[PDB]
Amino acid sequence: PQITLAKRPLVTIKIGGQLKEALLDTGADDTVLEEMNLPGRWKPKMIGGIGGFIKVRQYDQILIEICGHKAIGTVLVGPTPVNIIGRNLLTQIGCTLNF
Amino acid sequence: PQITLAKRPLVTIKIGGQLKEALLDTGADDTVLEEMNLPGRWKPKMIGGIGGFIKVRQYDQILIEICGHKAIGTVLVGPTPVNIIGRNLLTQIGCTLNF
Ligand SMILES: CC(C)[C@H](NC(=O)[C@H](C)NC(=O)OCc1ccccc1)C(=O)N[C@@H](Cc1ccccc1)[C@@H](O)[C@H](O)[C@H](Cc1ccccc1)NC(=O)[C@@H](NC(=O)[C@H](C)NC(=O)OCc1ccccc1)C(C)C
Ligand SMILES: COc1ccc(Br)c(OC)c1C(=O)O
Ligand SMILES: COc1ccc(Br)c(OC)c1C(=O)O
């Protein structure tokens, strides 16, 4: 698809067997999801942005389906007000910026 | 151009008489620049990111050039570590996400 930016690029995703929306975010190095339960091991990490830092649980090898495209990578789960798809997954779905 | 996302989507911009690198940021509603002077009498504005909210300065009617594409709009200035080009400007230069 081609997505214009008059509105936030919020798209349907599937993760952990659940339908969610997430922001296709070219300004995010990493993928950061709203607090949710995922099974298995994780490691404590912190990530920084405009407000300072938040603490997140880092999960590896998480599958996310993004507009029907599969991506697998590292996902951080924590107190973000928006699910963020970062560049680690955007490259896997062949996402580019064009102008 | 077509910009892949293996690395940060940094491009050169011109603003306030200064050449700078900035992030083409689809996850940003607004454009936020590192501490600098801009012409005009600013208004206060709150913006929110990972880590919470910060208070920044809003300058309206600011000229910016982004890879040869001229734009005019509102630009925020505050304690960001990276110059961020947000959707308010990305739409003006005809920038889309594609996959
Ligand atoms: C999502 C993260 C992985 C992320 N950071 C990274 O990729 C790397 C690992 N971080 C990094 O390099 O951090 C270094 C450092 C360390 C300490 C503190 C400062 C910075 C990031 O925050 N990326 C942001 C840009 C940036 C990148 C590097 C360093 C600093 C910030 C935006 O691209 C990203 O798209 C976020 C997503 C977001 C939305 C809101 C809450 C949580 C996450 N957008 C934003 O931060 C923008 N906010 C918005 O667009 C919000 C949604 N709108 C808004 O504030 O509108 C005004 C409004 C407020 C209140 C009422 C009325 C209107 C901001 C740049 C303007
Ligand atoms: C550095 O500290 C953390 C980072 C991520 C997480 Br998740 C943490 O646990 C809540 C902690 C901590 O031990 O407080
Ligand atoms: C009013 O919309 C927002 C503005 C800034 C931020 Br930060 C928001 O959180 C993601 C929201 C929102 O929850 O929709």
The domain limits of chain B are 1-99
Contact between A81 and B51 under an 8 Å Cβ cutoff? The reply is no
A16 C-alpha to center of ligand 3: Å? 24
Does A51 contact ligand 1 (Cβ within 6 A)?
Answer: no
**Residue A26 phi/psi, 5° resolution?**
-70, -15
Is the CB of residue A85 below 6 angstroms from any atom belonging to ligand 1? no
Nearest CA in chain B to A96: B4
Distance A28 CA to ligand 2 centre (A): 21
What is the Cα–Cα distance from A11 to A67, expressed in whole angstroms? 7
What are the strands, taking DSSP E only, across A25-90? 32-34, 43-49, 52-66, 69-78, 84-85
Taking the alpha carbons at both ends of chain A, their separation in whole angstroms is 15
- Cβ of A53 and B50 within 8 Å? yes
Do residues A85 and A25 make contact, with C-beta atoms less than 8 angstroms apart? Answer: yes
Task: Please measure the distance between the N-terminal and C-terminal CA atoms of chain B and give it in whole angstroms.
Answer: 15
Q: Which of B9, B24, B97 sits opposite A3 (nearest CB)?
A: B97
CB atoms closer than 10 angstroms to residue A35:
10
The experimental technique used to determine this model is: X-ray
The architecture of the domain spanning B1-99 is: Beta Barrel (2.40)
Provide the 3-class DSSP secondary structure of residue A6: coil
Distances (CA, A) of A44 to A5, A57, A59, A85, B59: 34, 5, 9, 19, 39
Q: From the CA of B59, how far away is ligand 3's center (Å)? A: 21
φ/ψ region of B89 (left if φ > 0, alpha if ψ in -120 to 50, else beta) reads alpha
Dihedral sign, CA of A37, A38, A40, A46?
Answer: negative
Q: How far is it between the farthest Cα atoms of chain B?
A: 41
Cα A70 to the center of its chain, rounded Å: 13
Quick one: which H or E segment has residue B45? strand B43-49
Q: Does residue A11 contact residue A19 with C-beta atoms inside 8 Å?
A: no
Euclidean distance between CA atoms A95 and A74, whole angstroms: 17
Indicate which atom in ligand 1 lies nearest the CA of residue B26.
35
Residue bearing the CA closest to ligand 2, atom 6? A44
